[PDB]
From a paper:
[name] [name] and double-mutant E24A/[name] were crystalised in space group C2, with two molecules per asymmetric unit. The crystal structures of the three mutants containing the [name] mutation showed that the shorter alanine side chain at position 58 significantly expanded the size of the entrance to the buried channel. In all three crystal structures, a glycerol molecule, used for cryoprotection, was modelled into the electron density. The binding of glycerol displaced w2 in all three structures and hindered precise analysis of the water network in these mutants. However, examination of the three lysine mutant structures showed that w1 was strictly conserved, forming hydrogen bonds to the backbone amide of C33. When E37 was present in the protein structures, water w3 was observed to form a hydrogen bond with E37 in both [name] and E24A/[name] structures. Additional water molecules (labelled as w’ in Figure 4F–H) were modelled into the electron density in the buried channel in all the lysine mutants. E24A caused a 2.9-fold reduction in the initial rate, while [name] resulted in a 1.9-fold reduction in the initial rate. The [name] mutant exhibited an oxidation rate of 2.10 ± 0.17 × 106 M−1 s −1, which is also not statistically different from the wildtype. However, the double-mutant E24A/[name] yielded a rate constant of 1.47 ± 0.06 × 106 M−1 s −1, 35% slower than that of wildtype EcDsbA. These results indicated that E24A and [name] did influence [name] oxidase activity, but its individual effect may be too small to be detected in this assay.
[name] from [name] K−12 (EcDsbA) was the first and is probably the best-characterised DSB enzyme to date. This 21 kDa periplasmic protein is a dithiol oxidase that catalyses disulphide bond formation between consecutive cysteines of unfolded polypeptides as they are translocated to the periplasm. EcDsbA consists of a canonical TRX domain, a hallmark of proteins involved in redox homeostasis, with an inserted helical domain. The TRX domain harbours the conserved active site CXXC (C30-P31-H32-C33 in EcDsbA) that is featured in many proteins of the TRX superfamily. The acidity of this groove originates from a cluster of negatively charged residues (E24, E37, E38, D44, E85, D86 and E94) that map along a buried channel in the interface between the TRX and helical domains of EcDsbA.
Author numbering: 1 to 188
The structure:
Amino acid sequence: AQYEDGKQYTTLEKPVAGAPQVLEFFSFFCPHCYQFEEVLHISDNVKKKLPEGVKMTAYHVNFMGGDLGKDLTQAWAVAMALGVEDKVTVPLFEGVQKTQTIRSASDIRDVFINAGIKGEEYDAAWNSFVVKSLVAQQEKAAADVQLRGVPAMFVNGKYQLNPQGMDTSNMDVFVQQYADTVKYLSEK
């Protein structure tokens, strides 16, 4: 078959009840996640092909970067709570990996301030229990798919994308295949 379990995707031995329809894990410290988002634009290419009524969810992970990695998962919770993911994704990736100007929680906050989030608004979100719950949700979701590394993407809590089984010859053929596989899985 054109799509095969073990080729473009694998199947979770323990499917996750109630999981987001399309769930991406990443770290702003992960070099391959930087390529996925800033060079390949995997998330946007996937979103453009999702069936009607299917949304993409993206969660940050703690296991890269120590203290700052956890601060970034909390800041990503703030971005989710405030609905500013599209304002801060590029400056967080570039701040951590390109300019390496993000070295502390204050430097993360500066990205939000510079993007026009008011200081009081960021700080109230950072300290909120809504954000504490969002951190816990990101952690629980990684546990539920037995996450071992990033980038990673899971469809309907049942299928894990397998980019190492796709055609990696041309970067744009690869992005197309990745996005087409997510669409296929979302309809399975």
